[PDB]
Amino acid sequence: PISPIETVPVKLKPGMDGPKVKQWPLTEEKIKALVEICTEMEKEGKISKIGPENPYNTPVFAIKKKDSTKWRKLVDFRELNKRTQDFWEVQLGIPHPAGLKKKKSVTVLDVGDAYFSVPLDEDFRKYTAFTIPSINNETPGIRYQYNVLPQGWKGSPAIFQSSMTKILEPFKKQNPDIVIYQYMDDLYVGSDLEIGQHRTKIEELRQHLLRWGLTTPDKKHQKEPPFLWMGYELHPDKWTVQPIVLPEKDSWTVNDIQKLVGKLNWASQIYPGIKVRQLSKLLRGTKALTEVIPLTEEAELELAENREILKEPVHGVYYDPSKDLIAEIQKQGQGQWTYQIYQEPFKNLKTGKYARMRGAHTNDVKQLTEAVQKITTESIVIWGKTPKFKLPIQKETWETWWTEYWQATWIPEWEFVNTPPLVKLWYQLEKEPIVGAETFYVDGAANRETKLGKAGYVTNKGRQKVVPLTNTTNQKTELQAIYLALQDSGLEVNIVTDSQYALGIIQAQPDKSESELVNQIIEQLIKKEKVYLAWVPAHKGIGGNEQVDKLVSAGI
Amino acid sequence: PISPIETVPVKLKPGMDGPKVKQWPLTEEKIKALVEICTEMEKEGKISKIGPENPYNTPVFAIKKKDSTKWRKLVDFRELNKRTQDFWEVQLGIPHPAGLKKKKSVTVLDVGDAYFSVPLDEDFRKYTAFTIPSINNETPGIRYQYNVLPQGWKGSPAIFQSSMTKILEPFKKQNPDIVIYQYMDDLYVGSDLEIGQHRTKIEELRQHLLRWGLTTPDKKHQKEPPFLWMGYELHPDKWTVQPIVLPEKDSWTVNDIQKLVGKLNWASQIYPGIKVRQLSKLLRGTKALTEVIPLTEEAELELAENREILKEPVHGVYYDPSKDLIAEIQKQGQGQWTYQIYQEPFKNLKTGKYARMRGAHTNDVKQLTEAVQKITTESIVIWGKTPKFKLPIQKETWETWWTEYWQATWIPEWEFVNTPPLVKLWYQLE
Ligand SMILES: COc1ccc2c(c1)N(C(=O)OC(C)C)[C@@H](CSC)C(=S)N2
């Protein structure tokens, strides 16, 4: 049922030409499944049988998908798809539910085969030619030409989502506030009208459409209030995801842990509290999707700790442009943060989690402010505003990681919360060297190919030491040397460092790590009174390297 | 209702296609400000809607120029220039009057509205398409294409160049010594006259620019602690540089010297070959930090040599026009920042210390943007090219907040720092 809408001009990339093939000659019955459909598809004017003078072609799959009662075909445009020009992507995303409004009544209209109605430009039609030869080879050259947008074809969903944006336009103008949305084969119309009055606007629409060419048999708004939109479970006044049943096994491959890390992730939108850390922690082996990985006990400890919050269902509120937007962030440990966003207290709009990965030694204050951004970004992408932050961090420990940090940071409106796991500085180094305190010249060395280190130090009052190490990297060792040096000091100390690496890693004053080595330096720093970390260049005799690297000397 | 002129055929760079960048999500008030703008402009025949047959793109922002009242549109044409204008940096390039950097007082006028008259090529326009964003990805984009010359584009003043020479003519001879440079939508004007005398010399050009066409230099006004009364008067006469504040009172102790050995050891690959030995051997021992130790006899020959070598560089200043400047900024404190304009690492083409009050906003992402703008107008006056920045900031924070305190026409290319430098010690020219 061709539409009388302004068609769009399609072209093939310069230098190219339309495809040309000749398909796998079919027999009696299969051709009978094509002649029937095609010679009544032409009657409805979707195709047209143009014989000679057109040199191109394309194949026809006579695919009765599943096992239909009525025979169906499908012409594979794989070669054309390469040759045609580039269109603007319609799929510029997905309107995420958290930013949807409470539009009282809603309905969905099936614009499924509304692609074959919109017409294709009158010049391109030849590049969509396809032929079907007979069994007996008696009357060959049975070739049609597509009049409307064919299935699959690159520009189809492009041209459609644009043709139908022009079609709804006069309606939308005449009668606003009766908000429309569209995706592929759906029409999500909804307003603040009492059902019958809403049942009118729908039939008005259903007839404007029927007048513009595209038939829509959604028998009197034939679609129920509970919706399955791209996974999202939608109800006329709240949202969530309905089916999210993640099974368990006894010996699964990576192929299945990736689906696992998938669902738990997705569920993070609504279900307050969730972490997919340890489940993915071991996925390091980016091997084949057939190798089994004996899940750690800390992954089940999490998989189960998820299954509870996940079992008993959670609801989802909508947006109210007048009501505030305020978000808060809780520390869920292991360098994992979780946030919730509210207008009217407690009831949730959107929840989600931030977790720094692949690049350790990061600060908590820093990890906090990184999460805030992730959110400040997600806000503007959705609601169009920025959440007033509710944060578990003392101003006097924040402006000390604004005025003290190298990189520049910036968090908008934020207010102080109260929760046992407060975010703050556990320690802080000195700026001016300490008086009287013992001066520890530290040194550390290892083998580039013999891999057997040596730690140690020397003090301003002849107090030496060296703790031989094995299976320790030069980096680790330079680090181990300071810890050693930490342990042998009273309350306040001074430490001159060989390494810039270790220096710049202890300067940022971190806190968490899996490396017991760095965690152990941290612990010393936290209990110590006044710590001062100096630095002198290696390979240049600076400090005391003359006798300092003459003692920690290896056999190579 | 129109007046159709003639077109300069614009074509693409060595076998290239148009930019297909993506529209960064925008605030609400701003998406409202953009349609407020683009629709009147649509009525003005300047821009126009397209369909799917045009897959190209270019970012659109919103900025409140000078003072709060009305928004300005901005188009990150950074990719199209990269596409088209590196062949139009040749075929149709605008020469840089290298004396602009010496002229006592430079001023900048927004002569960007003058292009919106010149029609753009029927066959090229597609590559200037831009898209207006929607909140929460509800509705499909408000998709426009440029009919005339885009005010962002680096290939606009190149076209209007012809017309700009002809329109400025009467002034350039009535006022001969005045050096005028046209970079983008800007007209940099420089003389040897003092404030009072130059400020009117500019009004002169303004009125001349008014009469002779509808080219118009937008009204200038504002009042920050720093005098922002008349125009954006840059003074290329004060271009002197010595950020390296070597501690005169620091060689008293052991720790002071340990510091003094560190800064100096950088000036090694910067200033090829330096003598520091006689000083270093003074703390060759594992002594106490706070030990107030006097310097050795042959030590002064190490300090004062470099201390006088910190008064005259040599090769560095060599600007290769077939390469580009790199600007790297590093935070130093509450108000002060420090930059380095090099081109091939360690060879400093120009360094300086951006600053501001401690009793001011003391906002990091305000100073960073207002410093980025500075580093750049300076490099126009000097090199005629915008530097590649090496920013000390979170990629994603900048992407959010730059477009807020960015009172500026052009948008330089950028990069962000992953690691913590030792360069922000007291001040350091990398
Ligand atoms: C149960 O269905 C819904 C409940 C709430 C809303 C929606 C659907 N929304 C929507 O776009 O549906 C999906 C495809 C995103 C939109 C406009 S629907 C006319 C709004 S403002 N709130």
Side-chain angles (χ1 to χ4, degrees), chain A residues 1-23 25 28-62 65-66 68-69 73-90 92-137 140-217 223-232 234-247 249-276 278-283 285 288 290-291 294-296 298-300 302-310 312-322 324-327 329-333 335 337-346 348-355 357-365 367-410 412-423 425-446 448-450 452-513 515-528 530-541 543-545 547-549 551-555, chain B residues 1-65 67-69 71-120 122-173 175-220 223-228 231-236 238-240 243-248 251-277 279-280 282 285-290 292-304 306-309 311 313-322 324-356 359-360 362-421 423-426 429-430:
Chain A
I2 51 179
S3 171
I5 169 76
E6 299 82 85
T7 167
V8 179
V10 182
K11 255 175 184 166
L12 303 161
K13 284 150 166 169
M16 269 165 258
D17 188 63
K20 28 204 173 206
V21 199
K22 271 223 67 182
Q23 79 178 95
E28 1 76 36
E29 32 56 75
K30 274 284 197 175
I31 314 187
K32 257 279 166 57
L34 293 184
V35 184
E36 227 291 303
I37 288 69
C38 267
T39 316
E40 223 259 1
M41 190 170 259
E42 148 233 304
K43 295 190 182 304
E44 290 173 57
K46 282 114 72 177
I47 40 190
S48 303
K49 48 182 184 175
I50 224 174
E53 261 295 298
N54 178 67
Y56 316 70
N57 210 325
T58 295
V60 190
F61 257 38
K65 3 83 82 60
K66 297 182 179 177
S68 311
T69 57
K73 79 163 174 170
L74 239 146
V75 189
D76 244 354
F77 288 97
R78 15 98 177 275
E79 221 102 304
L80 187 53
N81 252 238
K82 315 172 183 174
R83 289 124 172 101
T84 64
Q85 61 177 113
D86 292 308
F87 289 93
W88 176 231
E89 274 234 323
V90 290
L92 271 186
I94 40 169
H96 178 266
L100 281 192
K101 298 200 179 170
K102 297 153 176 163
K103 260 45 191 188
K104 198 70 63 69
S105 187
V106 186
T107 319
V108 154
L109 272 109
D110 190 69
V111 283
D113 281 60
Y115 283 58
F116 265 74
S117 70
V118 174
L120 188 66
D121 196 288
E122 282 212 78
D123 281 305
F124 200 96
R125 310 181 186 210
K126 46 222 52 60
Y127 301 112
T128 70
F130 58 102
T131 314
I132 40 177
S134 80
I135 2 168
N136 305 345
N137 225 240
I142 309 177
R143 41 189 312 147
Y144 295 75
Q145 216 187 249
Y146 266 93
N147 301 109
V148 287
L149 299 193
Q151 252 191 297
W153 192 71
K154 169 105 62 78
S156 286
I159 294 167
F160 170 81
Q161 211 282 306
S162 191
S163 292
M164 265 224 38
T165 291
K166 278 185 297 185
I167 282 188
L168 291 174
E169 219 164 33
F171 182 81
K172 203 162 187 173
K173 285 175 186 156
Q174 296 164 235
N175 43 77
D177 294 282
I178 194 245
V179 172
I180 305 195
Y181 169 87
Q182 121 100 126
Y183 193 74
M184 304 184 151
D185 307 86
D186 271 18
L187 263 173
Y188 286 56
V189 191
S191 50
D192 286 17
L193 303 179
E194 313 298 319
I195 306 294
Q197 202 200 354
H198 197 272
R199 276 280 162 113
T200 57
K201 282 293 171 280
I202 302 306
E203 181 65 17
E204 281 171 68
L205 176 45
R206 183 185 172 240
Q207 282 297 333
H208 177 211
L209 301 170
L210 221 323
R211 275 201 263 93
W212 264 123
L214 41 110
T215 299
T216 307
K223 290 292 187 62
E224 35 54 66
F227 291 120
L228 214 200
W229 149 244
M230 304 309 258
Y232 294 84
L234 290 155
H235 304 138
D237 64 318
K238 64 150 67 286
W239 73 285
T240 306
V241 189
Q242 237 95 63
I244 187 68
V245 288
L246 35 102
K249 302 295 185 170
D250 48 287
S251 51
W252 42 23
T253 67
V254 192
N255 179 266
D256 300 275
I257 304 169
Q258 290 185 320
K259 284 171 63 179
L260 179 85
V261 187
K263 279 180 179 304
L264 293 172
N265 236 177
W266 183 247
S268 311
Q269 307 178 64
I270 345 82
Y271 298 83
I274 253 204
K275 26 191 174 185
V276 199
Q278 320 203 273
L279 287 297
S280 58
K281 200 167 289 187
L282 59 168
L283 208 85
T290 183
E291 75 112 295
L295 234 65
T296 84
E298 300 217 285
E300 186 235 73
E302 206 168 60
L303 185 57
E305 192 162 7
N306 278 178
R307 265 182 180 120
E308 182 149 87
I309 313 180
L310 210 122
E312 34 96 79
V314 173
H315 41 294
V317 110
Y318 281 157
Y319 188 41
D320 182 295
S322 70
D324 272 318
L325 253 184
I326 179 164
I329 328 167
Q330 320 308 330
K331 184 166 78 187
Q332 194 96 331
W337 301 69
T338 199
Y339 67 86
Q340 300 86 46
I341 336 152
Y342 56 94
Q343 304 198 260
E344 302 123 33
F346 237 120
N348 277 352
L349 190 44
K350 243 244 293 75
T351 46
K353 42 103 184 169
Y354 170 59
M357 284 285 128
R358 279 67 185 149
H361 309 104
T362 330
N363 195 310
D364 248 65
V365 181
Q367 219 169 148
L368 171 120
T369 307
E370 297 182 345
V372 182
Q373 188 47 235
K374 192 116 174 184
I375 294 165
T376 319
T377 286
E378 187 198 36
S379 294
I380 283 177
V381 180
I382 294 177
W383 301 296
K385 300 160 54 80
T386 74
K388 177 166 180 179
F389 286 81
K390 266 307 184 286
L391 302 178
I393 159 173
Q394 307 217 336
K395 202 186 187 184
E396 264 174 310
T397 48
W398 165 279
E399 302 193 314
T400 46
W401 206 247
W402 176 36
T403 310
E404 208 165 278
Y405 189 39
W406 56 275
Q407 156 168 293
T409 37
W410 193 246
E413 291 183 302
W414 64 306
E415 199 172 43
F416 181 55
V417 190
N418 218 316
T419 312
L422 182 68
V423 199
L425 307 158
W426 316 102
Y427 65 108
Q428 194 163 129
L429 322 199
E430 315 314 292
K431 29 192 52 54
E432 295 185 55
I434 315 179
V435 288
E438 204 163 40
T439 317
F440 286 54
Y441 283 58
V442 138
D443 214 307
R448 298 239 110 95
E449 264 220 72
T450 93
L452 40 90
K454 275 189 177 177
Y457 67 96
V458 163
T459 71
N460 67 113
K461 8 192 71 278
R463 180 158 156 198
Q464 300 170 52
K465 188 168 194 185
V466 171
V467 165
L469 316 184
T470 302
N471 260 341
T472 59
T473 148
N474 222 297
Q475 276 166 237
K476 179 168 178 170
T477 296
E478 294 144 331
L479 220 21
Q480 168 92 49
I482 315 163
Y483 177 40
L484 236 257
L486 287 154
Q487 296 160 308
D488 307 0
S489 304
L491 279 184
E492 57 174 44
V493 82
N494 300 244
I495 302 182
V496 204
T497 328
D498 196 43
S499 204
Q500 203 175 74
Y501 156 92
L503 171 85
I505 280 220
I506 296 185
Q507 228 94 301
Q509 50 214 285
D511 47 56
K512 292 182 177 178
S513 272
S515 179
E516 253 285 83
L517 186 94
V518 202
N519 297 310
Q520 246 174 345
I521 290 169
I522 279 160
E523 293 156 23
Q524 304 286 333
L525 285 162
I526 300 177
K527 203 171 188 294
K528 282 267 176 293
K530 298 190 178 176
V531 205
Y532 181 99
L533 249 62
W535 182 83
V536 287
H539 293 306
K540 238 233 184 180
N545 255 276
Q547 98 261 92
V548 182
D549 204 275
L551 47 92
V552 282
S553 54
Chain B
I2 47 187
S3 53
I5 317 177
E6 185 183 34
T7 50
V8 185
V10 193
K11 246 65 229 70
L12 276 170
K13 202 180 186 190
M16 266 149 261
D17 199 66
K20 302 193 178 177
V21 191
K22 296 305 180 187
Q23 169 61 42
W24 314 97
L26 279 169
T27 294
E28 181 198 63
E29 60 176 349
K30 288 180 209 245
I31 304 174
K32 264 190 289 99
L34 294 215
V35 201
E36 193 174 72
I37 277 168
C38 291
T39 299
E40 266 118 79
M41 201 188 259
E42 182 182 11
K43 292 171 190 174
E44 295 171 356
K46 305 175 175 175
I47 66 186
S48 290
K49 289 195 165 199
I50 347 156
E53 4 81 339
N54 174 347
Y56 317 85
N57 213 264
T58 285
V60 223
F61 298 95
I63 308 186
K64 243 162 161 53
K65 240 209 184 192
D67 210 58
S68 39
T69 18
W71 302 82
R72 313 300 144 191
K73 171 192 252 169
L74 230 76
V75 257
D76 190 87
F77 266 118
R78 283 188 286 187
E79 192 83 343
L80 182 54
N81 300 356
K82 285 174 79 285
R83 301 298 231 256
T84 66
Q85 215 255 359
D86 215 72
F87 192 16
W88 282 52
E89 185 184 44
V90 173
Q91 291 186 320
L92 196 7
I94 304 175
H96 173 262
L100 189 45
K101 49 174 184 268
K102 305 292 179 174
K103 295 284 168 173
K104 236 158 174 293
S105 280
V106 179
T107 292
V108 196
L109 316 165
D110 181 76
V111 186
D113 308 282
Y115 318 152
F116 282 146
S117 51
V118 188
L120 187 77
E122 202 169 276
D123 297 1
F124 175 64
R125 284 159 173 161
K126 63 189 189 161
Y127 315 137
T128 59
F130 57 108
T131 289
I132 328 185
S134 37
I135 303 90
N136 199 83
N137 224 70
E138 324 272 8
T139 44
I142 304 173
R143 206 166 155 69
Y144 284 149
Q145 169 178 106
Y146 263 93
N147 296 300
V148 308
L149 283 209
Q151 191 181 324
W153 200 25
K154 243 176 178 217
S156 279
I159 282 177
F160 193 79
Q161 193 182 11
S162 72
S163 326
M164 172 71 63
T165 309
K166 195 222 127 303
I167 290 168
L168 287 175
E169 208 59 77
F171 187 82
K172 269 212 270 190
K173 313 294 201 205
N175 300 271
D177 296 3
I178 281 174
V179 184
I180 293 172
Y181 186 6
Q182 194 190 25
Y183 192 30
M184 225 73 67
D185 321 348
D186 317 322
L187 206 77
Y188 294 81
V189 196
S191 66
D192 308 296
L193 302 157
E194 54 167 51
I195 10 280
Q197 259 293 308
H198 170 256
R199 288 170 165 204
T200 67
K201 234 54 77 187
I202 299 305
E203 255 274 90
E204 210 172 284
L205 172 43
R206 275 212 160 188
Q207 259 69 263
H208 173 268
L209 274 161
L210 233 54
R211 313 182 280 243
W212 272 86
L214 221 58
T215 61
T216 313
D218 230 291
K219 298 180 70 174
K220 271 291 297 169
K223 189 181 172 191
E224 212 175 67
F227 297 165
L228 315 187
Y232 187 37
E233 298 138 86
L234 318 161
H235 301 48
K238 299 176 181 172
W239 267 210
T240 40
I244 293 178
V245 286
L246 208 288
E248 58 102 11
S251 53
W252 237 304
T253 61
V254 185
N255 196 56
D256 285 14
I257 294 171
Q258 276 177 61
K259 294 178 160 167
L260 194 52
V261 171
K263 299 161 62 77
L264 287 179
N265 197 49
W266 203 197
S268 298
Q269 259 307 281
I270 286 181
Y271 294 171
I274 255 181
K275 290 295 176 177
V276 280
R277 285 179 173 179
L279 179 60
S280 70
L282 153 74
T286 49
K287 278 226 74 200
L289 279 181
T290 22
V292 182
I293 67 161
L295 308 170
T296 74
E297 44 193 58
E298 49 221 70
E300 200 64 81
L301 313 172
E302 302 295 90
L303 170 57
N306 299 334
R307 200 161 184 178
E308 285 306 308
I309 300 180
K311 259 63 209 293
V314 285
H315 169 262
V317 198
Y318 137 71
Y319 165 50
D320 172 25
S322 289
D324 16 52
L325 305 142
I326 301 174
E328 100 158 59
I329 312 166
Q330 57 255 167
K331 183 165 76 267
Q332 220 73 207
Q334 295 285 271
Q336 295 175 326
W337 293 73
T338 58
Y339 63 112
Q340 270 96 53
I341 327 186
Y342 43 83
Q343 193 156 193
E344 218 92 67
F346 290 73
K347 298 291 195 181
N348 283 315
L349 247 176
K350 172 187 188 182
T351 84
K353 183 169 280 179
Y354 168 59
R356 243 299 73 203
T362 332
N363 168 12
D364 280 8
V365 199
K366 160 188 198 180
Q367 288 165 0
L368 178 59
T369 284
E370 297 191 308
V372 176
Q373 276 185 29
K374 274 186 190 181
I375 306 313
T376 304
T377 20
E378 290 192 339
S379 181
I380 305 308
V381 162
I382 301 183
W383 290 288
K385 49 165 51 200
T386 51
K388 170 184 74 191
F389 283 95
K390 276 188 152 199
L391 289 148
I393 200 176
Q394 196 181 329
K395 176 175 195 296
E396 289 89 12
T397 283
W398 179 266
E399 292 170 72
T400 282
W401 303 80
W402 69 271
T403 195
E404 207 73 53
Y405 335 51
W406 187 251
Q407 290 162 81
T409 25
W410 38 252
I411 296 165
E413 304 269 346
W414 41 45
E415 204 169 73
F416 311 96
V417 176
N418 335 94
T419 52
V423 184
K424 62 154 291 183
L425 64 205
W426 272 283
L429 340 178
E430 204 264 354

